[PDB]
Amino acid sequence: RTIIALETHDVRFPTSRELDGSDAMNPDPDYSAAYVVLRTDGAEDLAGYGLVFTIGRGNDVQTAAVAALAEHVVGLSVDKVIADLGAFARRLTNDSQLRWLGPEKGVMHMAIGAVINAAWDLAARAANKPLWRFIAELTPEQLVDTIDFRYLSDALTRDEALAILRDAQPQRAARTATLIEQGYPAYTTSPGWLGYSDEKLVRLAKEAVADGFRTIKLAVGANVQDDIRRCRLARAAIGPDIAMAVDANQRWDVGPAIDWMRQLAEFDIAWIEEPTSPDDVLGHAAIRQGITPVPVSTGEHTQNRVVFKQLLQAGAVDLIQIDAARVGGVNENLAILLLAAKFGVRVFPHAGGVGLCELVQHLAMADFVAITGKMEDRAIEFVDHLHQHFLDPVRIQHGRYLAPEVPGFSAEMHPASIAEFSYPDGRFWVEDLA
Amino acid sequence: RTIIALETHDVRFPTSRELDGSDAMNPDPDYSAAYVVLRTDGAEDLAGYGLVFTIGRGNDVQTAAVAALAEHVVGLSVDKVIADLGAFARRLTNDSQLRWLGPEKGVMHMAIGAVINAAWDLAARAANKPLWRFIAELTPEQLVDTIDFRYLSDALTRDEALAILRDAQPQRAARTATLIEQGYPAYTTSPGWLGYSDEKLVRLAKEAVADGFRTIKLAVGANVQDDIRRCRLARAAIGPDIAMAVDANQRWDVGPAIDWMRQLAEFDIAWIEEPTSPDDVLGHAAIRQGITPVPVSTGEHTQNRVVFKQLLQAGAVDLIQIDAARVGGVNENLAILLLAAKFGVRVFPHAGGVGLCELVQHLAMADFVAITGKMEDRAIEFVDHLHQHFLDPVRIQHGRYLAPEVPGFSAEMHPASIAEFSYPDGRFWVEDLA
Numbered sequence: 001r002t003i004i005a006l007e008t009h010d011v012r013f014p015t016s017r018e019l020d021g022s023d024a025m026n027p028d029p030d031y032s033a034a035y036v037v038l039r040t041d042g043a044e045d046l047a048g049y050g051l052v053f054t055i056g057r058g059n060d061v062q063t064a065a066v067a068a069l070a071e072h073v074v075g076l077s078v079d080k081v082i083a084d085l086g087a088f089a090r091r092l093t094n095d096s097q098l099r100w101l102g103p104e105k106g107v108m109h110m111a112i113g114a115v116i117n118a119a120w121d122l123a124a125r126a127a128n129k130p131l132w133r134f135i136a137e138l139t140p141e142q143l144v145d146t147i148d149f150r151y152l153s154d155a156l157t158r159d160e161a162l163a164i165l166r167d168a169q170p171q172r173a174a175r176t177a178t179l180i181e182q183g184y185p186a187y188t189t190s191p192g193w194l195g196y197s198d199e200k201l202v203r204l205a206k207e208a209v210a211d212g213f214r215t216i217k218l219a220v221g222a223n224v225q226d227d228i229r230r231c232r233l234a235r236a237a238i239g240p241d242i243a244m245a246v247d248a249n250q251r252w253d254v255g256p257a258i259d260w261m262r263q264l265a266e267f268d269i270a271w272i273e274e275p276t277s278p279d280d281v282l283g284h285a286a287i288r289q290g291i292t293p294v295p296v297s298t299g300e301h302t303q304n305r306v307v308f309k310q311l312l313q314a315g316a317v318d319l320i321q322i323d324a325a326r327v328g329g330v331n332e333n334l335a336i337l338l339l340a341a342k343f344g345v346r347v348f349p350h351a352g353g354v355g356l357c358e359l360v361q362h363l364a365m366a367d368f369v370a371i372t373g374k375m376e377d378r379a380i381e382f383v384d385h386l387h388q389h390f391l392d393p394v395r396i397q398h399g400r401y402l403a404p405e406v407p408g409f410s411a412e413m414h415p416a417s418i419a420e421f422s423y424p425d426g427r428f429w430v431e432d433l434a
Numbered sequence: 435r436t437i438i439a440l441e442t443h444d445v446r447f448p449t450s451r452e453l454d455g456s457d458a459m460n461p462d463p464d465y466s467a468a469y470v471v472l473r474t475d476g477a478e479d480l481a482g483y484g485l486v487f488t489i490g491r492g493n494d495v496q497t498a499a500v501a502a503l504a505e506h507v508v509g510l511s512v513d514k515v516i517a518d519l520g521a522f523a524r525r526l527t528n529d530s531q532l533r534w535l536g537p538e539k540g541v542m543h544m545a546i547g548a549v550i551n552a553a554w555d556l557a558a559r560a561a562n563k564p565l566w567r568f569i570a571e572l573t574p575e576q577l578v579d580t581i582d583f584r585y586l587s588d589a590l591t592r593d594e595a596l597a598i599l600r601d602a603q604p605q606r607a608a609r610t611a612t613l614i615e616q617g618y619p620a621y622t623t624s625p626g627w628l629g630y631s632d633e634k635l636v637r638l639a640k641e642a643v644a645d646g647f648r649t650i651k652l653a654v655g656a657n658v659q660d661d662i663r664r665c666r667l668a669r670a671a672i673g674p675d676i677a678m679a680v681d682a683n684q685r686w687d688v689g690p691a692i693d694w695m696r697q698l699a700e701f702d703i704a705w706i707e708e709p710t711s712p713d714d715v716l717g718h719a720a721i722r723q724g725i726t727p728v729p730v731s732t733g734e735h736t737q738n739r740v741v742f743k744q745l746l747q748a749g750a751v752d753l754i755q756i757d758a759a760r761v762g763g764v765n766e767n768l769a770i771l772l773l774a775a776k777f778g779v780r781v782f783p784h785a786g787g788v789g790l791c792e793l794v795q796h797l798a799m800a801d802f803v804a805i806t807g808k809m810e811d812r813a814i815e816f817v818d819h820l821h822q823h824f825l826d827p828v829r830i831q832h833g834r835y836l837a838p839e840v841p842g843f844s845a846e847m848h849p850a851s852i853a854e855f856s857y858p859d860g861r862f863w864v865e866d867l868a
């Protein structure tokens with residue numbers, strides 16, 4: 001079989017109508033997907049799906065970036081692609097001309113990451129396995145062959161990665177059983193969007209705990225008085241035993257972040273996410289040093305494994321987020337997970353976007369099985385939005401993610417959803433723009 | 435007057451035909467420009483020009499990113515835009531949805547930077563001044579009003595920037611006279627492209643020195659034996675008194691970079707440019723610590739002022755490059771120049787791309803007049819390619835840049851050049867692709 005087309009769609013959801021996903025930096029996001037399909041001349045089931053998550057404006061540019069990769073993939077042998085995902089990723093990441101648009105950052109890199117992710121979806125489907133098992137069941141050699149070790153020789157060599165993966169082999173099967181029977185811890189951010197009223201915040205926080213979530217997260221960062229008020233209300237609503245994280249979405253400078261967190265510390269903060277710019281490694285370390293022991297995290301916007309390496313080297317974080325679509329696809333996230341494991345830093349996957357819960361759950365689960373063997377000390381983010389648009393929506397049971405069973409990356413979306421929300425000619429948008 | 439249109443063009447030059455611009459990372463670049471025009475309903479002279487520099491593939495995506503900004507600018511009052519370039523820049527950089535595609539990095543940020551640069555071109559033209567004088571003659575208050583101080587409070591506050599600018603006021607006029615009469619030091623990289631034969635390297639290096647350049651730069655990084663051979667040949671060709679820099683274009687890891695430079699040190703290296711990833715602040719510092727006193731530089735791919743801040747804080751560089759199109763336009767480069775001045779780090783502007791000499795010369799000259807008052811200790815890069823396509827090509831006299839005189843950013847390109855090299859329907863490409 002051959003990849004005969006790279007199809008792209010600019011799909012946007014009107015989440016801003018109710019301010020779902022709203023925060024201090026992004027006050028009215030419209031969760032969007034630069035959706036891509038790697039089509040083949042095989043069975044209808046033999047296709048790869050992926051998407052870049054954006055929040056509205058710019059999604060057309062992001063979609064255009066993905067479409068520009070068609071000549072790089074159309075015509076390739078399916079067997080050749082899935083048999084060497086490392087070579088496939090490099091075919092895109094090593095194109096020096098595309099690197100100039102980055103390198104390995106921004107629109108062009110996320111576009112590359114979406115095509116790479118679609119290829120892993122295609123591979124998992126061909127293997128008749130949900131992506132987490134596809135990844136976790138590859139041999140240590142097959143796994144490191146997909147990783148780009150450039151710029152990491154000082155922190156993680158191929159031999160060091162192999163050692164970590166080989167050390168985990170004996171328990172892979174047992175952990176797979178544990179995951180399937182117990183699920184993976186989750187936490188929810190849906191009760192904390194900044195655009196919600198105090199009444200809605202409290203109502204949703206209570207429902208979240210009622211649903212079994214042992215941790216919730218609130219957006220903060222626009223007004224300290226508002227944050228103090230909201231954190232007090234949420235803490236009172238959930239009780240003293242539920243963890244409560246806060247997310248500043250990059251709003252603060254180093255000094256202000258320290259002073260701001262000093263005023264929220266009394267409410268028992270699980271961690272402060274993105275207190276400052278996602279590029280400020282030294283800044284996060286300075287903030288962490290100033291507010292310790294209040295935990296600091298960052299990661300959903302971290303451009304690539306080189307920046308993650310530095311965050312770990314500089315001791316800028318207590319835990320990190322990883323994102324399925326921000327970096328160079330699965331290949332890059334595997335490098336990041338191995339770096340986090342080697343440095344002994346917990347990973348709390350980011351999923352605050354359409355389709356992100358569906359995608360990222362697989363990376364966290366593969367990590368548990370083949371890399372760390374640790375999940376009760378961490379959690380996968382969850383947001384209660386737009387799951388109805390995916391063929392294999394995530395399943396949460398008593399605050400825990402159930403392991404996916406169907407083949408693939410869970411990225412495939414309902415054609416009806418694409419038809420209704422494609423921008424700007426989709427049914428909803430033609431009516432809305434009118 | 436009003437901005438009535440944002441016109442964009444995908445222009446690509448076949449520099450790969452002779453491997454002009456070739457290096458270890460980018461072996462066959464096709465110097466390209468994602469050209470933009472801010473058109474108004476005023477005089478034909480009243481327009482803003484700008485461009486994002488890329489090396490071929492991907493330029494269509496970059497052009498699309500710029501075109502996507504039309505709704506943000508079309509309809510704006512020319513007087514309102516030029517009277518507050520800080521507000522104009524923020525209108526684009528503070529669009530949270532566009533920030534998600536970055537933030538402040540990659541394709542979307544460079545697109546924003548090109549539109550911002552076009553606005554400064556428009557402003558300088560309205561003022562009937564070449565951009566360097568337009569910038570250097572603004573009051574300290576007007577200058578800081580254009581700067582985004584977010585994420586810089588720990589290294590450069592508004593008051594600190596004002597102090598530096600005010601300290602320079604007394605000598606602004608005298609330095610303007612000095613620049614106009616003496617020119618600004620330059621160095622050339624055109625003799626050192628990696629794709630050239632040893633014979634061509636030597637021939638061009640000799641011509642470069644004959645033309646008055648006191649410094650040349652060679653691309654290195656693919657094969658150490660080749661680098662040793664080429665550096666020996668170039669050094670012998672130029673003599674012991676001419677400075678010779680080398681550029682690895684991000685090829686090495688930390689350890690290898692140190693070992694590689696140890697083998698080139700005997701040829702008297704002026705500086706090693708981009709020894710590793712443009713995102714590795716800690717890595718550049720480690721390399722610098724290992725090869726000192728051999729100077730280390732980086733900057734042409736540095737995504738924004740936040741990364742530059744860290745490079746300075748971490749002592750990762752001996753000198754930095756700045757680039758007119760890589761960051762958020764003039765506004766961001768002013769912040770970077772002020773950071774470099776405050777930290778006492780020399781700036782050697784990057785210009786290895788089409789139109790970059792034309793653009794960046796203005797930033798270096800404005801810096802000399804209004805910020806540092808230092809130029810004999812540094813130099814502006816020059817490449818001997820494609821200047822014929824610009825209405826106001828740079829002028830080099832005895833190895834020094836002559837100060838531009840015509841109004842603007844020198845970005846305007848000949849319509850005939852655009853017609854011939856527009857991709858893929860331009861005259862040259864239709865014939866070439868055939």
Ligand SMILES: C[C@H](O)[C@@H](O)[C@@H](O)[C@H](O)C(=O)O
Nearest residue numbers: 021022023026029189352353
């Ligand atoms: C705009 C988005 O909803 C963000 O606020 C979201 O990704 C957030 O950072 C999160 O961690 O869930």
Ligand SMILES: C[C@H](O)[C@@H](O)[C@@H](O)[C@H](O)C(=O)O
Nearest residue numbers: 455456457460463623786787
């Ligand atoms: C592809 C380009 O010619 C680069 O090699 C060029 O920008 C180089 O880095 C330089 O500093 O001139």
Ligand SMILES: [Mg+2]
Nearest residue numbers: 247273274300
């Ligand atoms: Mg977050």
Ligand SMILES: [Mg+2]
Nearest residue numbers: 681707708734
């Ligand atoms: Mg360079």
